[PDB]
Amino acid sequence: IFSFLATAADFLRKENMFNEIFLPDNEETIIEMKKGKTFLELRDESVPLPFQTYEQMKDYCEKFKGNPRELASKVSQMQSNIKLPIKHYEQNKFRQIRLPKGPMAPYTHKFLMEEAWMFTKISDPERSRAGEILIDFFKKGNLSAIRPKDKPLQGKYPIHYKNLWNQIKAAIADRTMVINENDHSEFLGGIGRASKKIPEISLTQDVITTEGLKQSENKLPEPRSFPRWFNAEWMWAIKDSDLTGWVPMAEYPPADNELEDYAEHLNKTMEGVLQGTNCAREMGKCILTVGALMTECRLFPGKIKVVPIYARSKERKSMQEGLPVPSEMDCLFGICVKSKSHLNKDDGMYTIITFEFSIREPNLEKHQKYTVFEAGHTTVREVPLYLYCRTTALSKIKNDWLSKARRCFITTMDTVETICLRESAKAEENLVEKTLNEKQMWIGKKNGELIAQPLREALRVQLVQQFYFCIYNDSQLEGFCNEQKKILMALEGDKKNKSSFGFNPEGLLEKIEECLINNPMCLFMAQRLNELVIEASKRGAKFFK
């Protein structure tokens, strides 16, 4: 008996059931929730209207019987006073989207892509940090040969920018990437801009009447127009860059089966194709510059620093003839500067400054925020030189995400491998190289006609699309890309003669056009979607012109 009881007690204690509840005495056999006074007072007060005490509701529910007829009658009644509209798209077509009106949407990315000029040198493995390369490029004298003038082509506060550039050169000469706190930097750094708090306990009506202290009137963004410079950047980011290896990548592991061989082969093809473009160098630039800036913000806050805008690459591989084993290269596009990144909290902001080099004059519509200066001349023969200068800010999140800008490769590889494997399975044969060299994909229009090229060269469009999604990401683009799916699904239904329908498309168009403001990507993609539905109307219904 004692052994059995010991085993049972151990088991129960292990199950938390060794209490009066499961093992009561004769008396303690009535367990019940200790219904107090206040709880009951409330329960009898939260009851629906027709009842006034929980007892009535309980008696009505415990005895409730089904009367289908009254239910059907109420159903029909509610079905008559509603008049839910049903709209087959074929009869009620989709109008075009109404973009806003006003000035043009200007450049927003922190760094220049097409107008960027860079100085290159050879990389030595010993000197590989930024604070070192920024000096190496400084000794040869070109970085010091620059000497802008007090007369800017466009912009504001040119004196501050000039003094800041002079201080940057001086600090570089001192071998210390540091800057002192003067009036100029304090202004172009907003060092004293934060508002001074005033407690209410110390407040009075006379104080208010002295200086108006009304509630802040939020000035939401203002509209813009369609940018005409986006296609230029998109077409420039599709061509080679005279070098490769712009984006660092790891090594390939061994292989034992055909699967890994196939994967490695395809990955090598795609990586070699993509690493030569221009968008790639911008990705590498962002990666490295953001890494350096994050390190600095972590180590040297409360201190103005100097960080370069650079990248590392490798000259292309010619034939065995000539100098074999091509060398590496360190490229420098401009200079960057931070300002007291006291990142007390995520989503914060630390102002920075961008000094970049270019050889192309600006446009008022596009390069609106920049403040350009005429610097001098540089070789290639000699050509004039410009200095684009502006101000902006960043945060922890944008840093972390920009540093992680290698996801576009994953997405593109997914799409391509999917297409190729689907085409290969329908025929039960290795159709990958053929699908990459032959299968044509629409890209754009020229002279009112369509244009096409093999997937092997169309990958670049998807890559740039993903990169821009990573760059211009905001709430506006989020909502847009979330609300455009309906249109694509309706289009697919149109392609397959599926008689689609909807309840209120006008509201959908309204929701879409609501989130199109001063964000170039949304405007561009919306215009392109309109052009899509137009081109398809020649082959499909459900769209108005």
Partner RNA sequence: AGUAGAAACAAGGGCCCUG
Binding site for RNA (CB under 7 A): 108, 157, 188-195, 218, 220-221, 301-302, 340, 342-344, 347-349, 351, 369, 391-393, 474-476, 479, 514-515, 517-518
Q: Which does 342 bind (CB under 5 to 8 A by kind): another protein, RNA, none?
A: RNA
| Cβ proximity to another protein, 352 vs 526, nearer residue | 526
Q: How far is the CB of 415 from RNA (least distance, A)?
A: 26
By C-beta, is 46 or 379 nearer to another protein? 46
Element housing 87 (H / E): strand 87-88
What Å distances lie between residue 94 and 87, 429, 508, 511, 524, CA to CA? 11, 42, 10, 14, 19
Q: Which residues contact 53 (CB under 8 A, 6 or more apart)?
A: 44, 47
Name every residue whose Cβ is closer than 8 Å to that of residue 477 and which is 6 or more positions away in sequence.
469, 519, 521, 522
Which stretch, 58-66, 93-101, 104-112, 305-313, contacts another protein (CB under 8 A)? 58-66
Do the beta carbons of residue 544 and residue 96 sit within 8 Å? Answer: yes
Q: Which residue's CB is nearer to another protein, number 61 or number 380?
A: 61
Closest approach, Cβ 457 to RNA, in A, equals: 32
Give the per-residue contact string, 464-503, with another protein (x = CB under 8 A; - = no).
-xx--xxxxxxx-xxx-xx-xxx-xxxxxx--x-xxxxxx
Task: Kindly state the smallest distance separating residue 471's Cβ from another protein, in Å.
Answer: 7
- 455 vs 521 by CB, closer to RNA: 521
Q: Which residues of 239-258 are buried (b: 16+ CB within 10 A; e: fewer)?
A: eebebbbbbeeeeeeeeeee
Q: What is the DSSP letter of 407?
A: H
Are 62 and 185 contacting, i.e. CB atoms less than 8 angstroms apart? Answer: no
In terms of CB distance, is 89 or 117 closer to another protein?
89
Tokens standing for 304? 């103005």
Contact partner at residue 133 from another protein, RNA, none, CB < 5 to 8 Å by partner kind: none
Q: State which residue, 86 or 220, has the beta carbon closest to RNA.
A: 220
Task: Please tell me whether residue 222 binds another protein under the rule CB under 8 A.
Answer: no
| 145: its two tokens | 């040969």
Q: Measured between alpha carbons, how far is residue 229 from residues 442, 460, 509 in Å?
A: 21, 19, 26
Q: Work out what residue 93 binds among RNA, another protein, none; the CB cut-off runs from 5 to 8 Å by kind.
A: none
- In angstroms, the Cα distances linking 147 to 31, 153, 163 are 90, 15, 11
Q: Confirm or reject binding of residue 201 to another protein (CB under 8 A).
A: no
Question: What are the Cα distances from residue 2, in Å, to 5, 14, 16, 350, 431?
Answer: 5, 18, 21, 73, 76
In the complex, least distance from residue 145 CB atom to another protein, rounded to whole angstroms: 30
Instruction: Classify burial at 57, counting beta carbons within 10 Å of its beta carbon; exposed 0-12, middle 13-18, buried 19 or more.
Output: middle
Stretch that binds another protein, among 99-107, 315-323, 372-380, 437-445 (CB under 8 A): 437-445
Q: Does 258 bind another protein (CB under 8 A)?
A: yes
Q: How far is the CB of 139 from another protein (least distance, A)?
A: 20
Nearer to RNA, 234 or 370 (CB): 370
Q: Which is nearer to RNA, 211 or 347 (CB)?
A: 347
Residue list 300-339, contact with another protein (CB under 8 A): none
Going by C-beta distance under 8 Å and a sequence separation of 6 or more, which residues neighbour residue 200? none
Give the total residue count for the chain. 545
By CB under 8 A, tell whether 91 contacts another protein.
Answer: no
Q: Considering the complex, what minimum distance in angstroms separates the CB of residue 470 from RNA? A: 13
- Does 213 bind another protein (CB under 8 A)? Our answer is yes
Q: CB under 5 to 8 A by kind: which of RNA, another protein, none does 286 bind?
A: none
For 480, counting Cβ atoms within 10 Å of its Cβ (0-12 exposed, 13-18 middle, 19+ buried), the class is buried
Minimum Å distance from CB 401 to RNA? 13
| Minimum separation from the CB atom of position 66 to another protein (A) | 5
- When asked if residue 393 is in the footprint of another protein (CB under 8 A), the reply is no
Among 378, 511, 513, 537, binds another protein (CB under 8 A): 511
Residue 391 beta carbon to RNA: minimum distance, rounded to whole angstroms? 5
- Cα separation, 536 vs 268, in Å, equals 36
Which one of another protein, RNA, none is in contact with 481 (Cβ closer than 5 to 8 A by kind)? another protein
Q: How many CB atoms lie within 10 A of CB 282?
A: 26
Exactly one of 206, 256, 321, 382 binds another protein (CB under 8 A); that residue is 256
Helix (H) or strand (E) holding 294: helix 279-299
